[PDB]
Amino acid sequence: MTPKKNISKGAVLHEKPMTVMVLTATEPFNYKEGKENMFHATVATESQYYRVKVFNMDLKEKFTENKFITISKYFNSSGILEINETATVSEAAPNQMFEVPKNIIRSAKETLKISKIKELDSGTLIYGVFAVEKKKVNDKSITFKIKDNEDNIKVVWDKEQHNINYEKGDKLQLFSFHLRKGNGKPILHSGNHSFIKG
C-alpha cells in the first residue's frame, strides 16, 4: 500500500509491460499542497489511446511528445493509467515501436460533445476543450457554464482559491473533471487531479 501511493483506489496493478507513444503532456503542477507535483498526459498504442496521470516528477523528461516509452507496474483506474514510483518507465526499444493510427491520435485530441458527455456514466473523468458562456464566482467555488453549438453544462471548481483567470468567451481546456449525474441536471466537477488550462 506504499507501492500504491497517490494511486486512486480500485486501480489495478499491471506488471504487463506495454509500450506507448506520447501524444501530449502538461506542465507539472501542484494539485495538493504539501504533495509532489503531477502532470497529465495522453498516450497511444496501435489499438487505442490512454489518458495518464503521472505522480513521479523524475519522469517529466521521459514524457515528451512523439516519444515512445515502455511502461510496467503501472496502474489502471477505470481506463485511466496512473503512474508512480512503483512503475518502471524506460525509453522504448525500436522493435517495440509502432505507427499510431491517425484516427486514434485524433480521437485522443478530440473533444466530446456536451450532449454526448451527459450520457456517459457518472464518475467518468471528462477531458476536453470548451467555450465559456458564463461565470459565477463566490468564496466556496467558481461555476463556469461551458457551451457547445447544441448544449451547455456547468463545470464547478472548488479547490485552489481561484488562481485561474478565465472569463466569458474564452476557451478552457479541462483535465480529469468528474461527471456527476444524479437527481438534477448533470454537472462537471473538479476532483483531486482536476486541471484547467486556457
Side-chain angles (χ1 to χ4, degrees):
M1 269 323 314
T2 204
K4 294 168 61 168
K5 189 182 174 156
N6 300 339
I7 303 292
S8 311
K9 191 36 199 205
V12 169
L13 180 59
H14 276 258
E15 292 164 36
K16 315 93 199 183
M18 180 178 60
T19 295
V20 305
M21 174 186 155
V22 170
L23 296 183
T24 187
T26 70
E27 66 270 27
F29 66 99
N30 178 90
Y31 70 92
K32 190 59 187 305
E33 58 180 341
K35 278 306 191 175
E36 189 177 358
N37 285 1
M38 78 173 292
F39 65 93
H40 296 276
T42 287
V43 304
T45 52
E46 299 188 70
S47 2
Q48 24 95 195
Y49 82 92
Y50 293 86
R51 280 157 196 152
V52 181
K53 299 175 172 178
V54 189
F55 305 99
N56 189 352
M57 286 303 97
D58 305 4
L59 284 183
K60 186 51 188 71
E61 164 79 343
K62 291 262 192 56
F63 278 81
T64 309
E65 61 202 343
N66 303 326
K67 231 67 174 299
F68 287 76
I69 55 179
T70 297
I71 71 178
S72 53
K73 293 182 179 174
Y74 60 96
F75 293 87
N76 193 322
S77 185
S78 303
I80 315 287
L81 303 189
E82 290 177 357
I83 308 186
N84 66 344
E85 12 287 331
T86 305
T88 295
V89 180
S90 52
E91 176 164 38
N95 55 16
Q96 296 297 116
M97 294 187 176
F98 48 86
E99 189 179 21
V100 179
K102 185 189 177 181
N103 72 92
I104 297 295
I105 292 186
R106 306 229 180 184
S107 304
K109 56 182 297 194
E110 206 184 2
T111 293
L112 253 56
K113 299 201 69 69
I114 297 180
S115 52
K116 286 299 182 188
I117 288 186
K118 291 181 177 180
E119 294 171 8
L120 299 167
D121 290 332
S122 186
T124 305
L125 297 182
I126 305 300
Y127 292 75
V129 187
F130 314 96
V132 175
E133 194 195 315
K134 184 174 300 185
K135 179 159 144 197
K136 195 209 173 181
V137 193
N138 50 276
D139 303 331
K140 53 187 202 277
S141 58
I142 300 175
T143 306
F144 297 97
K145 189 185 216 177
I146 59 172
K147 73 150 55 171
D148 260 342
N149 283 313
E150 283 83 350
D151 205 343
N152 65 81
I153 196 185
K154 278 186 182 189
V155 195
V156 357
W157 170 277
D158 57 351
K159 60 157 50 157
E160 62 154 350
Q161 80 123 54
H162 317 337
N163 159 275
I164 70 185
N165 307 287
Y166 311 113
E167 210 64 23
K168 145 148 46 180
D170 287 275
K171 265 183 174 53
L172 257 48
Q173 188 179 354
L174 269 56
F175 294 85
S176 186
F177 280 75
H178 295 65
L179 167 65
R180 300 293 187 209
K181 266 208 300 172
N183 176 254
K185 306 185 190 181
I187 64 167
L188 297 195
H189 194 68
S190 55
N192 208 20
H193 313 141
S194 295
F195 189 55
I196 311 184
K197 183 183 174 184

